[PDB]
Assembly symmetry: C3
Homo-oligomer: 115 residues x 3
């Protein structure tokens, strides 16, 4: 698929998702929620959407990545919503792996008001 930017890595066939990288250094205060920039834009294959989810690597550092949805239509740059649930400040280095992007099929149906 087509991408723009360099904050995303190719993956192995047996891997489920692509690693997302922080576009710059980030400092998270205790309890802070922050949208982390990746600097990448994607062109998803029709019929699919991207699920953003945490990597165990950073989850073990006290940072919870909130579930993200990348729509087939979405052409903006990808940001990862992250919260620091620990009691101290945490720093993320530039280009550090922060999340995983997984491409899943999406089903579209019309809504009928029935019983």
């Amino acid at each position: 698929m087509i991408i723009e930017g360099d904050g995303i890595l190719d993956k192995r066939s047996e891997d489920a998702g692509y690693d997302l990288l922080a576009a710059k250094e980030i400092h998270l205060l205790p309890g802070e929620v922050k949208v982390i920039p990746t600097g990448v834009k994607l062109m998803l294959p029709k019929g699919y959407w991207g699920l953003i989810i945490g990597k165990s690597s950073i989850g073990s550092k006290g940072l919870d990545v909130l579930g993200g949805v990348i729509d087939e239509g979405y052409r903006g740059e990808i940001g990862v919503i992250m919260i620091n649930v620990s009691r101290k400040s945490i720093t993320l280095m530039e280009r550090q792996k922060i999340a995983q992007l997984i491409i899943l099929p999406c089903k579209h149906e019309v809504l009928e008001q029935g019983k």
Copy 2:
């Protein structure tokens, strides 16, 4: 898909999921967990289940969705388990958008004891 209620909105073909609205005003203290009623019931097509995920606008505020798994064989009023993981209280308003329902395919396998 067949629905009952109006706490869900239709989507574009390029939209991965359908927006879910809050059926009433909800106040959440820091660390508190509440189920937010949507006032909607739905019949999932065969072979699919529904995943609930929060929208960027609420996640960006410290709200997360717990156990957003709607089973293909479920017919009660869809309720969203929401947790306020931020350090302050927040109020979600009536009919405010709060999550998205994405329809994904089911995959049923039989569990077989064996050598991995």
Copy 3:
């Protein structure tokens, strides 16, 4: 599919996923991050991965269950990561239900620099 272990339960066809059980009694001190062992190994079918979603009941009980991903090629023992977000110690008991395992299709493609 082939499994090794006792920490997972068969599911109905209407159930999107299988329940995962804590393999042992785990003690989490206030603010501690820990990997809860399930004692199960899977041999996921080709082209599919495993999505782990925490059980709502435990997320309501002072523990933040991180969403996890089991890769098709992953053959190790399944573990669930959790963070004690309360001001008190929390004990998880052996055989207690901690999450669900959903099997979903995975898409693989080479990444191509282009213009979006």
